[PDB]
Design a protein around this ligand. Structure first.
Ligand SMILES: [Zn+2]
Ligand SMILES: [Zn+2]
Ligand SMILES: [Zn+2]
Lengths: 129, 89, 196, 223, 55
RNA sequence: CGCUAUUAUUGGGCCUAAAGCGUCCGUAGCCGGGCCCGUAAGUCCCUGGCGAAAUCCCACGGCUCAACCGUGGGGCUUGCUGG
RNA sequence: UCCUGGCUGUAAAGGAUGCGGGCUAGGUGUCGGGCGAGCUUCGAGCUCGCCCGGUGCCGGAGGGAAGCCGUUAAGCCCGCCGCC
């Protein structure tokens, strides 16, 4: 059945972007999805995501602008130390600074660049480029 | 376990009968008066080691990393291959 | 308001479509009859006709090509040509007119007008290969693929086709300023209709 | 000399050729991202005279083929050729005939007619220079069963790829690259086509203005 | 030089795409660029100045 | 050993080329919807005690240079343990 | 070969395609239920459209060595078993 909703959200975004859609809806919402969309908006891959309240959960309305090539979840959520980000970069991204690796830390969800500035590690969840 | 033997300080080509490489090495051997192929490969291996150290040290974080960087550049200056105002690239 | 009286529109039969439908046409479909016939609205026809008139008037005439494989649309296209300087190919559109310079009647225009993007599919493929906009008359059963400007109207009636091409030519001349007022263009719509 | 010779010893047959002859179009880059059709090799002979030197006209493969009849076997020759400028322009073509010269001529003309722009840069973790000596990011291509993946490399690391890819990339102007492949590479036609499509796919990636400076991206010719 | 961009999607035009460009048939002041995928799939477009909302 | 993505975590295949149990029920195991509170076992950071030497990387020095030997900085020891 | 009570556990037992969930144009048929319009010999009747669920034929983008598949994927993602 439904096991992971973040993966579904990201695959839906990927396909809709591939075929040229303007807006997309993400039916089962979650705070992880909210934070990931926040990071994507900060780094300039989407625009103007909004939360809508049906009595079950939240729905997310997202607008697309034409900047995503591929977006996907990372399973399993590998743990990663502050001195091992290069391996996973070379594995998931096509150039030395091209795209973002999204990391969950005990200080919050952020990009691996900020996590390296702060000098901490965590769990890999998603990648975008 | 097994103890360590001493290993060559030069490498051979992957394929021995490629026309481009043959021509290049023939020209070099003739122009520099080298006895045999083994010398060329020794110098090429020196260069390859320098290049590999550069690639590894490039954009790496650590005091030991910057130490190795400065050591490489100073060794090159002393050997006479680069000037005093030179960068890893 | 309307460029031509609604009575004239409806007597020509421009609001009439087929039984089949499509998702691309839900924009223009206004009602469903009780016999399974889908009916169009004429305001969008008028708006798109004005827009297409402006567009085409922004082009030099002889670099304009019109096509109609259907029998009921051959004479209207010929009159559109005679009246706007455009070229017209009613019969068959020999494959290669736009891609093989070795043929005799080799041309390469700036814009294309088709009566039906399905019947006139050979011409639409070749235009896609040269990079020119496409203006097309579309019915309820038509797709809007490889179509840059669309005009909703019946696509099989002699009177409807004659009226639409009459209006198009008149608007083109009006926007080119070859006439000061529309009423300065009294060529009878009955000169466009096919002769029985 | 050659300019005026080729420009006045030829009468065009298309509107692009007419524009190029009268002089409204002067640079090779003005013909690409508009949906024009190219039917005359003289267009490219004019806007790029470097694709007429023998140093830039590599022939990649010759093959013999057969058709059987109630009498016997009718032989035919297939030729795969490539042409290019070594500063960001390359084309690939095929030609069929009954003799090698006919085949080669037709193939070179089709190659001229099929030319593409590519982007170049550095991209690699290990160089991080802003010189267009490689591709700026990794790309993929396919044709038949052949699947090619090109990755950017550092300077001094020359073209770690098969011979056909070596030649195509050398004519396109790339000097350093890593590769990974799958499928039957012993089909020269499909291997070459997959490399060609991988190169074409440098324009299908969406970039941001920062990346341009970060990677030294160059479209077409440089400086 | 500059690389054109599609009006519906924000992706660059490739050097040999079956794309098209034309002047807006309402205002006459903006150039509409359409790519092959959008043309095939019949993706609608909107002028950045007048908002004519065409096909 | 590599070539070999012909053992495939990275990174392979199962309509017709080798390959979906005849079909279903369910035990262990693996995978599991959204919100709030707590704990801190996994997880991340910092610091203490260990993981012999030789072997491996770098620089300087002594045998003509080198191989070799010496001084110093890193690594290795697949990790354990106190806060 | 049929009937009554048992054993055997095999088939081209084939959609030659394991099961669950999410996404990526549609068109036209037919079975069941429901809603809304109209006709009606007033019948559990006839025609048209829409929603849900089944079951077919076509087909764009896309995929594939190709034959072909193509919202009843042989496409992109999240899982588990069996086999080469
Ligand atoms: Zn570089
Ligand atoms: Zn587009
Ligand atoms: Zn406009």
């Amino acid at each position: 059945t439904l096991l992971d909703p973040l993966a579904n959200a990201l695959s839906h975004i990927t396909n809709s972007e591939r075929v040229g859609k303007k807006e997309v809806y993400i039916k089962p919402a979650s705070k992880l999805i909210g934070e990931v969309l926040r990071v994507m908006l900060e780094n300039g891959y989407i625009g103007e995501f909004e939360l809508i309240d049906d009595g079950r959960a939240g729905i997310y309305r997202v607008q697309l602008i034409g900047k995503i090539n591929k977006a996907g979840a990372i399973k399993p959520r590998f743990p990663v130390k502050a001195r091992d980000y290069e391996k996973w970069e070379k594995r998931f991204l096509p150039a030395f600074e091209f795209g973002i690796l999204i990391v969950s830390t005990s200080q919050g969800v952020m990009t691996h660049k900020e996590a390296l500035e702060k000098g901490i590690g965590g769990r890999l969840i998603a990648y975008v480029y | 376990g097994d103890p360590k033997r001493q290993r060559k300080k030069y490498e051979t080509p992957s394929h021995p009968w490629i026309k481009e490489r043959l021509d290049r090495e023939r020209v070099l051997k003739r122009n520099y008066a080298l006895k045999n192929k083994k010398e060329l490969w020794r110098h090429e291996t020196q260069l390859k080691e320098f290049r590999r150290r550069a690639r590894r040290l490039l954009a790496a974080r650590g005091k030991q990393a910057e130490i190795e960087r400065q050591q490489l550049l100073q060794r090159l200056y002393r050997l006479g291959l680069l000037p005093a105002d030179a960068v890893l690239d | 308001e309307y460029l031509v009286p609604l009575d004239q529109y409806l007597a020509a039969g421009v609001h009439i479509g087929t039984q089949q439908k499509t998702k691309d046409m839900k924009k223009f479909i206004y009602r469903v009859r009780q016999d399974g016939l889908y009916v169009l609205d004429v305001r969008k026809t008028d708006e798109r006709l004005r827009v297409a008139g402006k567009f085409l008037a922004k082009f030099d005439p002889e670099s304009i090509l019109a096509v109609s494989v259907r029998l009921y649309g051959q004479r209207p296209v010929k009159k559109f040509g005679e009246v706007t300087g455009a070229k017209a190919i009613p019969g068959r559109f020999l494959p290669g007119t736009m891609t093989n310079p070795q043929v005799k009647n080799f041309i390469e225009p700036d814009v294309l007008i088709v009566t039906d993007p399905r019947a006139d599919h050979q011409a639409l493929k070749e235009a896609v290969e040269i990079g020119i906009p496409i203006v097309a008359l579309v019915d309820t059963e038509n797709f809007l693929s490889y179509v840059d400007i669309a005009i909703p109207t019946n696509n099989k009636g002699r009177k409807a086709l004659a009226l639409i091409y009459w209006i198009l030519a008149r608007e083109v001349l009006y926007n080119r300023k070859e006439i000061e007022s529309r009423e300065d263009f009294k060529i009878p719509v009955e000169d466009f209709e096919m002769r029985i | 000399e050659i300019a005026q010779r080729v420009l006045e010893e030829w009468e065009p047959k298309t509107k692009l050729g007419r524009l190029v002859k009268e002089g409204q179009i002067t640079d090779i880059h003005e013909i690409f991202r508009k949906g024009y059709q190219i039917k005359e090799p003289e267009i490219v002979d004019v806007l790029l005279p470097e694709v007429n030197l023998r140093e830039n006209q590599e022939v990649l493969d010759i093959a013999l083929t057969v058709r059987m009849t109630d009498s016997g076997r009718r032989i035919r020759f297939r030729v795969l050729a490539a042409v290019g400028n070594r500063d960001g322009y390359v084309g690939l073509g095929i030609g069929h005939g009954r003799e090698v010269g006919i085949a080669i001529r037709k193939a070179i003309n089709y190659a001229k007619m099929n030319i593409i722009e590519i982007k170049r840069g550095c991209g690699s973790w290990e160089c991080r220079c802003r010189r267009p000596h490689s591709i700026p990011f990794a790309v993929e291509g396919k044709e038949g069963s052949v699947r090619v993946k090109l990755m950017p490399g550092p300077r001094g690391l020359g073209l770690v790829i098969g011979d056909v890819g070596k030649k195509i990339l050398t004519l396109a102007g790339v000097q350093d690259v890593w590769s990974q492949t799958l499928g039957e590479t012993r089909t020269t036609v499909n291997f070459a086509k997959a490399v060609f499509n991988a190169l074409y796919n440098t324009n299908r990636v969406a970039i941001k203005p920062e990346d341009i400076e970060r990677y030294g991206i160059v479209v077409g010719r440089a400086m | 030089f500059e690389v054109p961009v599609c009006t519906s999607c924000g992706k660059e035009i490739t050097p040999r795409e079956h794309a098209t460009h034309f002047v807006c048939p309402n205002c006459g002041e903006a150039i509409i660029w359409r790519c092959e995928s959008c043309r095939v799939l019949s993706v609608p477009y909107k002028c950045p100045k007048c908002g004519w909302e065409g096909p």
